[PDB]
Swiss-Prot record, chains A, B:
Residues 73-163 form the ARID domain. The lineage of its organism: Eukaryota, Metazoa, Chordata, Craniata, Vertebrata. This is Lysine-specific demethylase 5A. Changing residue 146 to E: Decreases DNA-binding. The gene is KDM5A. It comes from Homo sapiens. The chain holds residues 12 to 785 of 1690 of the full protein. Histone demethylase that specifically demethylates 'Lys-4' of histone H3, thereby playing a central role in histone code. Does not demethylate histone H3 'Lys-9', H3 'Lys-27', H3 'Lys-36', H3 'Lys-79' or H4 'Lys-20'. Demethylates trimethylated and dimethylated but not monomethylated H3 'Lys-4'. Regulates specific gene transcription through DNA-binding on 5'-CCGCCC-3' motif. May stimulate transcription mediated by nuclear receptors. Involved in transcriptional regulation of Hox proteins during cell differentiation. May participate in transcriptional repression of cytokines such as CXCL12. It is found in: Nucleus, Nucleolus; Nucleus. The GSGFP motif is required for the interaction with SUZ12. The ARID domain specifically binds to the CCGCCC motif and is required for the lysine-specific histone demethylase activity. The PHD-type 3 zinc finger is required for the interaction with histone H3 di- and trimethylated at 'Lys-4'. Residues 8-49 form the JmjN domain.
Length: 577, 577
């Protein structure tokens, strides 16, 4: 009944192609970009040893109910649409609180609270903790009394209303033991050896279980795991181990995921600036049927995924150019609701059957990631999938020159939503511009093209605001103040280049894209807090344009300057020797 | 000229004594407690391999100038003594800020700011970053413009005052590469091979350099290094490695500083409650002359230090009974000053030459810690020391049954100062009481003796506050609220068992020892936020008294119930077999 989509392309590089990963990926970009994802096979000779033990590797499992794994169900959508309209009528507006790093499920919450007899029922009986349990929340963190506070503040008024009449007052594991678990589960299911069941079959049964209410099937996985805390499944050198000579090669290989962020073609390279939250790999342990719902990467850009071992990982990709189109069909389900809550679209997890996306005219490709094979995700390429069986993988994100404009275009979208930004994109650009040398010339070139766009756009914003009647201009260093302090009153975006402060608050801020929403105090007295005076234009565009056009001339002791200035080669350097 | 003090004792336990670390210490306590510190030599067969690589191990070095290593110098004291009196006059009070984990040195700061021409001079020249650099503050974290905020708020008014007339407005490295450094330095100094210089000679030369303005000497070290981030110098099992069978021994050893916190006699054992900041060891890399000033561990408990390798580490300890006597003599230096700033005594680092504390009547012992030896610190044992040469060491704190009453006493002191408690001593006690089984019988017996004292004291504080005219009593879970929120207005102590709130502030809190300081709002309406109703007394004292007095009778299938209830042996179990 279910239909496997087309296979995304694979690549099987030579050892010389395999040398510089980000060059090889640049080689591959014009092609793989159209599928949104692609698979890569390192030379069969390349097989890095697994660093981690298993027999002792301890993790707290998370869980999925494949029935309710879909959050976009008609009943959940229509509910929230109604609770929203309720608060609109009330003059308030519905705000969905975040709990345990994920949005609260109100439909689930309201159902459950009511199933046991309602707010004050649950309250007087102190069952609020029993609730959060069934909600997939980790005890004993105190979520129970937090849900009460939330239910009262949001759902109880609607309860009353939705209830009879009323509404007067008030208002305003071990990796080892997990494999045993995982392999026992799969075999008993399919009645075979786990390795012996074909991929097509499990794939077919997976999408069967999602929409099937005739049965319930639960699974355990793990994620939200860091090389930092849990250690990398790769050998690498920091202080903690004498590294074996066997391992020495792989540890220094750019394909070792810990090494990618620092590669000279990486943006998060020579900058020592901030923790973006991924300079460091993330680990996903898996079982059969264990899944990850449709999504993209923070600030878009890339994602590289590597399966260390275990049964294959199943993927579904979509191109970056089909991105808007994708979100458009998902929006057809609750158009009135997604209006009021634009970002709620992303908040809500979905596995939308690929056939449905394809019948709607969206390109959807796929593949089976097998042990020892990479998967690459491109900027704004939507991806999802599941695992064939017990397995282990490691994944980072990253960025390159080509991404810079997309990353800028990415903020504007996050700014147009109300979306917290994991860093300042514009801040990043200057941290690169402030050390032009030892910077990959490709970045330098792109930065010139990207930066002049912002100097224009900023000067427009800077002159736009003096008309509004602000006078004083203070000067502050934004990178040194914490992200949450430098955000904009309603954007919500991390400000670097400039923002606006009036005296209505000691600290509350708004970016120049929303100057009027700072506070009712007339423009009147000040204050534009800026970063650079406009003396910046000659200064910083110089150093980057230098190395940008130092390379432009150098191509048109010459083989020396390349080594001194750290130019790339391939190509040209071949003509030399 | 310098005189070596008496040596603290060493202990060379048998392999059978060496099997349980915390038992063997209690064996020793009545003796070593009187010296305040002791050295411990494991069986020579015991040689755990060093888990950490060196050639790549990266640490950011801190630095020490032994001349100014002394913060209690006369000139600095009188300066601070005056600056306080200045502000007393102004109606304000002198509040010494903390900057990057430690108190700001105002005397140094002012001296420097004044040497370059003072506040507005430095400001208009933007040299505030040059300042913090010479104050040692790590760039580029923004400390420079932070000091400017501080100087103006404190020193500038005094600057004007202390300046002519005025004062109108306003107001209100690699371990490898480090080994090379330390060895070269140590050898070029004494003109010998580094291992060839006697211990007694360096000791003499060290204390010479402290009081010597005749010459300047700078030294590098590292510290504030966690096993968490950097990894432990011990083998151990979590997920980061498969452990060699050679290492399997030492990984599980109770003498592995990773295991100590979890040992059955530890308090930080079976409770899974809160990060104490030490369940985890810490690392100190060291050099010739690198030092650590007099101090007691937080909450007055223990520190067990294992020197992994390199040249020896020199210690100076003091008994816990001489502690109050110790602080007294350092207080004689600026009694007027320390009155206004009681805790400034601890804040200020001092190396006071042992010969002085001895001639002031303070017991002062010592010893030479050699690679592969342990150093144990007893509760409220003041200790300082320096390193003989290049080495590596690892340490953790820990708590035992005998410490509990001292921990309680410590809070009472931290409360009588204004001192931030790293955790709530009372909360700890109840988390243990809440799991009586599988809890070491000695703890249980102690707990009941400790807890009953608290039920009395609390009920005294509980009945005391109703006379004050508070009525309503709410009930809150304090452990689930963050520490800094549950502190006291002025105590400043983490409140758990109870505290007092009113409506003047939505959240601002005061410990029941200080109900009057909450606000001017008359007692009037409420609000006592308590934890347990007084239904606690029968309940919790039971479960602990159960296992406490279950063992009392058991000593007075019998060898079974000891295995079931996890009783200890030594002793009695020997009569069994
Ligand atoms: C069942 C464990 N989870 C996963 O395997 C998992 C991924 O493989 C993944 C790949 C790419 N981007 C995001 C992802 N998120 C995930 O959770
Ligand atoms: C020069 C390297 N530093 C140290 O060796 C060092 C200690 O041994 C130490 C022991 C106990 N309590 C605090 C300590 N602090 C320290 O810094
Ligand atoms: Ni992803
Ligand atoms: Ni100490
Ligand atoms: Zn904005
Ligand atoms: Zn205003
Ligand atoms: Zn009040
Ligand atoms: Zn208090």
């Amino acid at each position: 009944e279910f239909v496997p989509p087309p296979e995304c392309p694979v690549f099987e590089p030579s050892w010389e192609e395999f040398t510089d990963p980000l060059s090889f990926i640049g080689r591959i970009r014009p092609l793989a970009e159209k599928t949104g994802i692609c698979k890569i096979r390192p030379p069969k000779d390349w097989q890095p040893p697994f660093a981690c033990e298993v027999k002792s590797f301890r993790f707290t499992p998370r869980v999925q109910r494949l029935n309710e794994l879909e959050a976009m169900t008609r009943v959940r959508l229509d509910f929230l649409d109604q609770l929203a309209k309720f608060w609109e009528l009330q003059g308030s507006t519905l705000k969905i609180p975040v709990v345990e790093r994920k949005i609260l499920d109100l439909y689930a919450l309201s159902k459950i609270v009511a199933s046991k007899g309602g707010f004050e029922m649950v309250t007087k009986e102190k069952k609020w903790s029993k609730v959060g349990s069934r909600l997939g929340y980790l005890p004993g963190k105190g979520t129970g009394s937090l849900l009460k506070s939330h239910y009262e503040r949001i759902l109880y008024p609607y309860e009353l209303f939705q209830s009879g009449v009323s509404l007067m007052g008030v208002q305003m594991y071990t990796l080892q033991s997990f494999g045993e678990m995982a392999d026992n589960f799969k075999s008993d299911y399919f009645n075979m050896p786990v390795h012996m069941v074909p991929t097509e079959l499990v794939e077919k049964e997976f999408w069967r279980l999602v929409s099937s209410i005739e049965e319930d099937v639960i699974v355990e996985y793990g994620a939200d795991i860091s090389s930092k805390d849990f250690g990398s499944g790769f050998p690498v050198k920091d202080g903690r181990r004498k590294i074996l000579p066997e391992e020495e090669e792989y540890a220094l290989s750019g394909w070792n995921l810990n090494n990618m962020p620092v590669l000279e073609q990486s943006v998060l390279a020579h900058i020592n600036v901030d923790i973006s939250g991924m300079k460091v790999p993330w680990l996903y342990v898996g079982m059969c049927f264990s899944s990850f719902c449709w999504h993209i990467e923070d600030h878009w850009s890339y994602s590289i995924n590597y399966l260390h071992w275990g049964e294959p990982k199943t993927w579904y990709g979509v191109p970056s150019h089909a991105a808007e189109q994708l979100e458009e069909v998902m929006r057809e389900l609750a158009p009135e609701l997604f209006e009021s809550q634009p970002d709620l679209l992303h908040q809500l997890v979905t596995i939308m059957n690929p056939n449905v996306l394809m019948e709607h005219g969206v390109p959807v490709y796929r593949t089976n990631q097998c042990a020892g094979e990479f998967v690459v995700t491109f900027p704004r390429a939507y991806h999802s999938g599941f695992n064939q069986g017990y397995n282990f993988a490691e994944a980072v994100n990253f960025c390159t020159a080509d991404w810079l404009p997309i990353g800028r275009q990415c903020v504007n979208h996050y700014r147009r939503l109300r979306r917290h930004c994991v860093f300042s994109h514009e801040e990043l650009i200057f941290k690169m511009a402030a050390d032009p040398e030892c910077l990959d010339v490709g970045l330098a070139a792109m930065v010139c093209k990207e930066l002049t766009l912002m100097t224009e756009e900023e000067t427009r914003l800077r002159e736009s605001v003096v008309q509004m009647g602000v006078l004083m201009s203070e000067e502050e260093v934004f990178e040194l103040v914490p992200d949450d302090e430098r955000q904009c009153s309603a954007c919500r975006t991390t400000c670097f280049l400039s923002a606006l402060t009036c005296s209505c608050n000691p600290e509350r801020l708004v970016c120049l894209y929303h100057p009027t929403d700072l506070c009712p105090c007339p423009m009147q007295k000040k204050c534009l807090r800026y970063r650079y005076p406009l003396e910046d234009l000659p200064s910083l565009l110089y150093g980057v344009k230098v190395r940008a056009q130092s390379y432009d001339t150098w191509v048109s002791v010459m083989l020396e300057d390349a080594e001194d200035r750290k130019y790339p080669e391939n190509d040209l350097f071949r003509k030399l020797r």
